[PDB]
């Protein structure tokens, strides 16, 4: 009857929404693991002007 | 980054060992010549002495 075209909608979209949050989530992570990377990136750089400086 | 700040090391230790290296030789120049000149100025001593020797001859 009117059910089922909405328990299959219903059942398709759990799956979807739990795969968007892990790909999302995972993303995220990556990102803030760059930004991290980045700014060591940055530390390094501006490490050896300050000791460096001119001696 | 990393092998950078070790070149850079590399560079001031042949930078340190030079400039110590011109230091000492320059040291020893002045040494060497004030030796020398104080070995001239005997000598000139010695002339002089000579000639008073000579006179006295």
Redesign the interface.
């Known amino acids: 009857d009117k059910l089922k075209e909405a328990e299959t909608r219903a059942e398709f979209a759990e799956r979807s929404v739990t795969k968007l949050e892990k790909s999302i989530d995972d993303l995220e992570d990556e990102l803030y693991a760059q930004k991290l990377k980045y700014k060591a ?1 940055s530390e ?2 501006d490490h ?1 002007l300050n ?2 400086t001119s ?1 | 980054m990393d092998a950078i700040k070790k070149k850079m090391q590399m560079l001031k230790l042949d930078k340190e060992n030079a400039l110590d290296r011109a230091e000492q030789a320059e040291a020893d120049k002045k040494a060497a010549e004030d030796r020398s000149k104080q070995l001239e100025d005997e000598l000139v001593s010695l002339q002089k002495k000579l000639k008073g020797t000579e006179d006295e001859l």
């Open positions: 990136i390094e750089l050896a000791d460096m001696i």
